[PDB]
Tab-separated table of C-alpha atoms in Angstrom:
chain	number	residue	atom	x	y	z
R	1	UNK	CA	103.715	52.635	123.605
R	2	UNK	CA	101.461	50.523	126.076
R	3	UNK	CA	99.636	47.771	123.673
R	4	UNK	CA	101.958	47.900	120.739
R	5	UNK	CA	105.525	46.575	121.753
R	6	UNK	CA	108.657	48.563	121.069
R	7	UNK	CA	110.162	46.033	118.623
R	8	UNK	CA	106.974	46.149	116.218
R	9	UNK	CA	105.835	49.434	117.454
R	10	UNK	CA	109.061	51.125	116.467
R	11	UNK	CA	108.249	51.188	112.802
R	12	UNK	CA	104.902	52.559	114.002
R	13	UNK	CA	106.404	55.266	116.175
R	14	UNK	CA	109.042	55.781	113.033
R	15	UNK	CA	106.589	58.251	111.449
R	16	UNK	CA	104.165	59.073	114.545
R	17	UNK	CA	106.581	61.318	116.487
R	18	UNK	CA	108.473	62.362	113.372
R	19	UNK	CA	105.281	63.598	111.896
R	20	UNK	CA	103.439	65.507	114.517
R	21	UNK	CA	105.327	68.906	114.232
R	22	UNK	CA	104.673	68.780	110.683
R	23	UNK	CA	101.179	70.440	111.358
R	24	UNK	CA	101.957	73.754	112.704
R	25	UNK	CA	104.431	73.631	110.012
R	26	UNK	CA	101.019	73.986	108.234
R	27	UNK	CA	99.988	76.637	110.537
R	28	UNK	CA	102.812	79.187	110.665
R	29	UNK	CA	103.028	79.068	106.738
R	30	UNK	CA	99.445	79.717	106.755
R	31	UNK	CA	100.276	82.331	109.443
R	32	UNK	CA	103.075	84.381	107.901
R	33	UNK	CA	101.843	84.729	104.505
R	34	UNK	CA	98.963	86.316	106.045
R	35	UNK	CA	101.295	88.225	108.364
R	36	UNK	CA	103.624	89.325	105.470
R	37	UNK	CA	100.480	89.821	103.426
R	38	UNK	CA	99.878	92.711	106.041
R	39	UNK	CA	103.603	93.350	106.577
R	40	UNK	CA	103.838	94.432	103.250
R	41	UNK	CA	100.297	95.952	103.536
R	42	UNK	CA	101.723	97.812	106.360
R	43	UNK	CA	104.021	99.165	103.603
R	44	UNK	CA	100.727	99.338	101.494
R	45	UNK	CA	99.423	101.139	104.513
R	46	UNK	CA	102.332	103.200	104.332
R	47	UNK	CA	101.925	104.212	100.772
R	48	UNK	CA	99.158	106.647	101.628
R	49	UNK	CA	99.781	106.705	105.370
E	1	UNK	CA	116.895	101.780	94.559
E	2	UNK	CA	114.232	104.447	95.479
E	3	UNK	CA	115.873	106.409	98.247
E	4	UNK	CA	119.402	106.583	97.624
E	5	UNK	CA	119.560	106.460	93.789
E	6	UNK	CA	116.893	109.034	93.050
E	7	UNK	CA	114.812	111.673	94.946
E	8	UNK	CA	111.407	109.833	95.727
E	9	UNK	CA	108.085	111.214	96.761
E	10	UNK	CA	107.228	108.543	99.215
E	11	UNK	CA	106.616	109.715	102.773
E	12	UNK	CA	107.239	106.756	105.387
E	13	UNK	CA	109.051	104.969	102.738
E	14	UNK	CA	112.332	107.037	102.780
E	15	UNK	CA	112.530	107.814	106.315
E	16	UNK	CA	110.387	110.373	108.272
E	17	UNK	CA	109.441	113.554	106.465
E	18	UNK	CA	109.683	115.013	103.011
E	19	UNK	CA	112.701	112.811	101.628
E	20	UNK	CA	115.540	114.997	100.628
E	21	UNK	CA	118.503	112.262	100.037
E	22	UNK	CA	119.883	108.997	101.311
E	23	UNK	CA	123.293	107.904	102.656
E	24	UNK	CA	123.660	103.936	102.834
E	25	UNK	CA	126.363	102.330	105.035
E	26	UNK	CA	127.204	98.604	105.070
E	27	UNK	CA	126.670	96.629	108.236
E	28	UNK	CA	127.115	92.829	109.452
E	29	UNK	CA	124.397	91.078	107.511
E	30	UNK	CA	122.571	94.494	107.352
E	31	UNK	CA	121.998	97.613	105.451
E	32	UNK	CA	121.879	100.887	107.186
E	33	UNK	CA	120.076	104.145	105.722
E	34	UNK	CA	120.508	107.560	106.877
E	35	UNK	CA	117.759	109.903	105.933
E	36	UNK	CA	117.605	113.550	105.383
E	37	UNK	CA	114.235	115.455	105.492
E	38	UNK	CA	112.919	118.653	105.415
E	39	UNK	CA	110.723	118.732	108.623
E	40	UNK	CA	110.163	122.621	109.626
E	41	UNK	CA	109.915	123.732	113.275
E	42	UNK	CA	108.304	127.156	113.799
E	43	UNK	CA	105.125	128.657	112.492
E	44	UNK	CA	102.464	131.358	113.258
E	45	UNK	CA	99.045	132.121	112.269
E	46	UNK	CA	98.219	134.157	109.054
E	47	UNK	CA	95.274	135.846	107.738
E	48	UNK	CA	94.097	135.547	103.914
E	49	UNK	CA	91.996	137.349	101.365
């Protein structure tokens, strides 16, 4: 934003800001199918609970 | 397909207590299960041989 100028930084900003929340995208998918791996292991706990 | 159909054996999987039977009801975007369980109340001591 400071050094690169917004005419020829806009194709750099084209997939900088658009790409950054693609990385807890990674994380929550890593979360829930450990969580739903236990949310069903809750039920697998519930098997002999 | 294991509480409404059929009489299961799975506690904490067909409600709370020894599962007797099951009544399903529709719901907005949901399914609601009633449950009938045989959960007795009153006891004593007793003495064996």
